[PDB]
Amino acid sequence: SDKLKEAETRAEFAERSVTKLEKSIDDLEDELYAQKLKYKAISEELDHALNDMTSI
Amino acid sequence: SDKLKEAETRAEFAERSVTKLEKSIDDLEDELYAQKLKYKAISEELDHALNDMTSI
Amino acid sequence: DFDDIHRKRMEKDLNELQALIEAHFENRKKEEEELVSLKDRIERRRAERAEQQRIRNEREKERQNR
Amino acid sequence: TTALVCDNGSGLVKAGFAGDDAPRAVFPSIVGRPRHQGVMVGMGQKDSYVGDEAQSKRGILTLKYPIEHGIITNWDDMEKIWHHTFYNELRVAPEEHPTLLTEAPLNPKANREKMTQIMFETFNVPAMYVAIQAVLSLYASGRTTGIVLDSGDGVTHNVPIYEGYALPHAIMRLDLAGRDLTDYLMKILTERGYSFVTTAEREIVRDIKEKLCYVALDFENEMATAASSSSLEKSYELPDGQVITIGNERFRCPETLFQPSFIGMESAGIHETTYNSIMKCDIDIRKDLYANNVLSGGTTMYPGIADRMQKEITALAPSTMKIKIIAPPERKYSVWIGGSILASLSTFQQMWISKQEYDEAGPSIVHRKCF
Amino acid sequence: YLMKILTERGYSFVTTAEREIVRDIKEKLCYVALDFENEMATAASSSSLEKSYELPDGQVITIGNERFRCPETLFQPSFIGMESAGIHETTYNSIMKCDIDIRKDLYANNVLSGGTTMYPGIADRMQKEITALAPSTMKIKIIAPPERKYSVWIGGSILASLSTFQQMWISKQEYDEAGPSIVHRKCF
Ligand SMILES: Nc1ncnc2c1ncn2[C@@H]1O[C@H](COP(=O)(O)OP(=O)(O)O)[C@@H](O)[C@H]1O
Numbered sequence: 001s002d003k004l005k006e007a008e009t010r011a012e013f014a015e016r017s018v019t020k021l022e023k024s025i026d027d028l029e030d031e032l033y034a035q036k037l038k039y040k041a042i043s044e045e046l047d048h049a050l051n052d053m054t055s056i
Numbered sequence: 057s058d059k060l061k062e063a064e065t066r067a068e069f070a071e072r073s074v075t076k077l078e079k080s081i082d083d084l085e086d087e088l089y090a091q092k093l094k095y096k097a098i099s100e101e102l103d104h105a106l107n108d109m110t111s112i
Numbered sequence: 113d114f115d116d117i118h119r120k121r122m123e124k125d126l127n128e129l130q131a132l133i134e135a136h137f138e139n140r141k142k143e144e145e146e147l148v149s150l151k152d153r154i155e156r157r158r159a160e161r162a163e164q165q166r167i168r169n170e171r172e173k174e175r176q177n178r
Numbered sequence: 179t180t181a182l183v184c185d186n187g188s189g190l191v192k193a194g195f196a197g198d199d200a201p202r203a204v205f206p207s208i209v210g211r212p213r214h215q216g217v218m219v220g221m222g223q224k225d226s227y228v229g230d231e232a233q234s235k236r237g238i239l240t241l242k243y244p245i246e247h248g249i250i251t252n253w254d255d256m257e258k259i260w261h262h263t264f265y266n267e268l269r270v271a272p273e274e275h276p277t278l279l280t281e282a283p284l285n286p287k288a289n290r291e292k293m294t295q296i297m298f299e300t301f302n303v304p305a306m307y308v309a310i311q312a313v314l315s316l317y318a319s320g321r322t323t324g325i326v327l328d329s330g331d332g333v334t335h336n337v338p339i340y341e342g343y344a345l346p347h348a349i350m351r352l353d354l355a356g357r358d359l360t361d362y363l364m365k366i367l368t369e370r371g372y373s374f375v376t377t378a379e380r381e382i383v384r385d386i387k388e389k390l391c392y393v394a395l396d397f398e399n400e401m402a403t404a405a406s407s408s409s410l411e412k413s414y415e416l417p418d419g420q421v422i423t424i425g426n427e428r429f430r431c432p433e434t435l436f437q438p439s440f441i442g443m444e445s446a447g448i449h450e451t452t453y454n455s456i457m458k459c460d461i462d463i464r465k466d467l468y469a470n471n472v473l474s475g476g477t478t479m480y481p482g483i484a485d486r487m488q489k490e491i492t493a494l495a496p497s498t499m500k501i502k503i504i505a506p507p508e509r510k511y512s513v514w515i516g517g518s519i520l521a522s523l524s525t526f527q528q529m530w531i532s533k534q535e536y537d538e539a540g541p542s543i544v545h546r547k548c549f
Numbered sequence: 550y551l552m553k554i555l556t557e558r559g560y561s562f563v564t565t566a567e568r569e570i571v572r573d574i575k576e577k578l579c580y581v582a583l584d585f586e587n588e589m590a591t592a593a594s595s596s597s598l599e600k601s602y603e604l605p606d607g608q609v610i611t612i613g614n615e616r617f618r619c620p621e622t623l624f625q626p627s628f629i630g631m632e633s634a635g636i637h638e639t640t641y642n643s644i645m646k647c648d649i650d651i652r653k654d655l656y657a658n659n660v661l662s663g664g665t666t667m668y669p670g671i672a673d674r675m676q677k678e679i680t681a682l683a684p685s686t687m688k689i690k691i692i693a694p695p696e697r698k699y700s701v702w703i704g705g706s707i708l709a710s711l712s713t714f715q716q717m718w719i720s721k722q723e724y725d726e727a728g729p730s731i732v733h734r735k736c737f
């Protein structure tokens with residue numbers, strides 16, 4: 001019984017850790033992807049600016 | 057016996073998974089920071105350009 | 113006619129340029145340096161988390177190894 | 179009170195109160211019924227998403243424009259679009275506001291009469307007035323003469339005006355516009371492997387056209403350069419990945435404007451219908467029209483068109499005249515800015531078609547003195 | 550298939566009652582490998598995978614690389630002779646048949662359900678496979694709620710508890726008027 005209680009508690013703690021880590025990963029992923037899209041957009045508008053310079 | 061075997065086994069899986077998750081988290085965060093720093097270097101390139109544009 | 117072209121053109125010919133330059137300067141100042149500093153801070157915290165994870169993993173592997 | 183300057187257009191409905199600089203709400207004019215079955219219950223699924231809402235759910239809709247070429251082909255959908263514009267994008271009941279619609283030149287009468295009948299019976303406005311889409315674009319430039327080429331998305335028309343006196347015998351209306359360029363681009367993209375068929379993917383091809391295409395200064399030299407080097411190939415990321423690379427399709431899509439033989443149309447390009455429209459005018463106002471050529475409308479926003487058109491007209495015109503092409507940066511909303519200016523005038527305040535006048539003469543009042 | 554590959558060590562289960570024992574073995578021991586070849590190589594050198602299990606009468610058995618070979622059949626249906634592609638590629642094919650504008654949302658909201666998706670380590674193998682197949686820009690996310698087994702029934706309870714749904718039932722008088730073929734009609 002003692003071993004069972006300790007094991008179950010350790011398991012539950014680790015499980016909740018797992019869930020929270022997943023949520024953190026998701027949020028950081030969303031922010032990083034938004035930054036990535038921002039970078040692609042800035043580079044593309046930069047190139048458009050370069051081509052505008054080429055025009056004039 | 058069945059219960060505690062199950063619990064310890066799934067707990068070990070949890071520990072290995074969560075450690076893999078932590079490696080994933082660190083790699084993602086560091087890559088995010090590297091990309092963000094590249095972006096800020098680009099922003100300061102643009103800010104030097106804006107200081108030139110202070111010509112207007 | 114053709115006398116409002118001055119009052120609708122010359123205005124933004126300077127005010128718009130100056131205001132957009134001001135906006136770019138303030139946005140760059142607010143954004144880039146703070147983002148790089150915050151990313152460095154988060155990196156340091158991440159390294160500390162890595163050290164804590166290594167210590168805990170090693171001590172648990174030491175005890176549990178049977 | 180203030181007047182509502184609506185501008186139906188064909189492709190983008192632009193509206194806003196009179197006296198401002200830019201339209202308050204600009205949104206595509208598409209009404210798309212859902213086409214699949216739908217299994218979730220209580221999701222609150224409507225029967226028709228109009229305006230900018232149907233550009234976000236376009237994956238499961240069948241978008242269909244209610245205005246084909248200037249004329250209106252589906253009156254129920256157009257009524258729905260107007261109702262949305264009044265109530266949700268401006269949130270002003272029409273019972274307390276005059277309206278100023280806009281209409282292309284040389285359009286069928288029944289279209290205009292039905293438009294005024296709807297505005298007076300369904301929405302019940304106090305007074306509405308219909309104006310030709312080119313005179314407004316001439317207002318916005320602050321001129322009083324000049325020949326304006328208003329290449330919209332539905333129809334391209336070219337109205338010459340001198341000293342405020344329009345020349346009705348010199349209006350050259352051509353039905354090539356942005357939509358035909360979208361279809362032709364969608365048709366030439368198939369030469370690389372990319373097939374867009376669904377009415378939803380027409381929007382993606384339109385975005386490609388807007389962001390990448392440009393008008394070549396000299397067509398043959400560009401065709402030769404794009405066939406040897408690879409400095410032109412610009413890539414673009416679809417709404418799901420799988421980037422595509424556009425080669426010499428970049429300047430071949432908008433070249434259709436100057437050579438309508440590409441899409442099988444017989445007529446001459448926009449570079450030669452302007453010269454023909456000028457030559458129909460009297461011999462003494464041709465210099466002023468040459469010097470004050472005005473561009474407007476969305477489709478004239480291609481990078482490098484104000485130089486190609488000037489080169490072409492200078493080739494056609496006599497060598498002594500000076501050819502100048504006015505291309506304001508606010509080209510897209512030029513018609514609406516002009517509409518706001520016209521509605522804000524005091525001299526114009528008695529030209530509205532008052533409701534009692536409509537009650538006495540019926541919808542045919544629009545062709546009468548109140549034009 | 551597990552009952553068929555267990556015979557490679559000497560354990561023969563034939564009776565329809567012993568299929569239940571093999572099912573219990575599959576539930577308690579099998580897991581989905583993140584990478585198949587590396588696991589096959591590791592299980593063939595070390596012995597860190599061999600987990601033992603006690604039959605309903607004693608005589609414990611030791612399962613070696615049968616652990617991750619049984620559920621691998623999901624991603625390679627050629628093992629049991631089926632032609633079709635695995636569950637990692639029929640999802641991508643099902644997505645690609647959809648319209649071009651809703652593929653991002655489907656990529657981001659891939660949902661797992663049903664009992665058999667409870668293998669330890671499947672939500673990572675499937676994500677790795679789809680990320681390999683899908684374009685590099687899209688984000689691939691696999692929703693794997695802990696209450697996977699009863700997900701269908703929980704959803705059924707929610708649907709039956711809705712007020713808007715209360716008039717969609719096939720009332721008995723309607724069946725009396727149109728016969729059993731009423732189900733294909735409007736009341737789906
Ligand atoms: N920046 C741009 N570059 C190239 N083409 C454009 C651009 N913006 C709009 N267009 C084209 O012009 C059309 C919009 O024209 P618009 O002036 O709104 O028509 P309308 O006269 O009906 O309002 C779009 O369909 C698009 O094809």
Ligand SMILES: [Mg+2]
Pocket residue numbers: 187188311328330331475476513
């Ligand atoms: Mg227009």
